[PDB]
Amino acid sequence: VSESQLKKMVSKYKYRDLTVRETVNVITLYKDLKPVLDSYVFNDGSSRELMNLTGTIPVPYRGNTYNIPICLWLLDTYPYNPPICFVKPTSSMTIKTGKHVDANGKIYLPYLHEWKHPQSDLLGLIQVMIVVFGDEPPVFSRP
Template sequence: MAGSSVTDETKQALSQYKYADIAKRDIMNAISQFKDLRPELERFYFGDGTKKNLLNLNGTIPVNYEGNEYNIPIIVWILDTHPYNSPMVYVKPSNNMYIKANRNVDSNGNVNIPYLRDWRYPQSDLLGLIQFLIKVFGEEPPLYSSSVASQQRHQVQSEHLSSVSDERPNISSFPVTGLAPLTTPGLEDIEKRLMRFLKLVRLSRDALQIFFDDIFPEHELQNMLADKKYLIVNGEKRVQKDQIPVLYPG
């Protein structure tokens, strides 16, 4: 639909409005000033589950933010009791945008501003509403592009890493002559280290065995066994259950 004209579909939809002439005039006045908005007839679903075919103004409005102009996509739903009941306004982020919730817009894109809360005809109309939206969106933009969001996250991460590095010594300033670079050991290296460890364990066990063999010669061991204080189970010396436990290396 052309931005500054009312089609037959719109005229037919307006015939279902209680104040069709006033609503038509209000719509024409708004789209004549903001030509990127176009009237459309679509089905609106209310919070209680009911649905109704309503007119809306769908498109973008120019918003100046920090010296740059941005086209903010919105949709203004016009009730069939317009202009005696306030419209419903939503921001409509595209695929490369996300909603920045603030005091004027919630996370679902629903716009809640004083102009809507204080709506009263004839002091309030669609043109005044759009002008108010441009003002508040210029103060607090409701949408950001994904590239801006990514840059902001990167900046926050960089600032965090910078603050952490400031609290730690700068290892790059330490002398590192003769030190090998730190690397993550591979599987083959890990296996070699494990084999060396097991070999050391076996050597330690053999050394302990020789040590205790020197303390308890074989004839003393045979005497202990003759007293039936010990049993040999799977080659290990163990105390009989009816004897007082005695620490003895196995």
């Protein structure tokens, strides 16, 4: 959470200061997102220790605010490749599938599709997600 501890976590990232700068900003703006270092399993079959920003973001829907649980995986080429993003329901939630969310909870957005540094960043991504999810919540928890 301190810049210095963040900089150690991302010690094998290609663009470290760029990764850390945006990370510090996301976690200051979104106090319920936290940087964790965890193994990400690719389709190629192999694993990688990568930094994940994980926790919840606040989403207004029909006049109330919901804490929607997400995961934002940063590739070691961050910021030049978009993060890989998931909704993360708890055992007492369901994923609600749609245009922007598949049954594994993976997120699909023009913002991700059009990602280009430096015009695209995590702050702008999160805001897009808030607009999309406030219009169509990707997790359900009640009838």
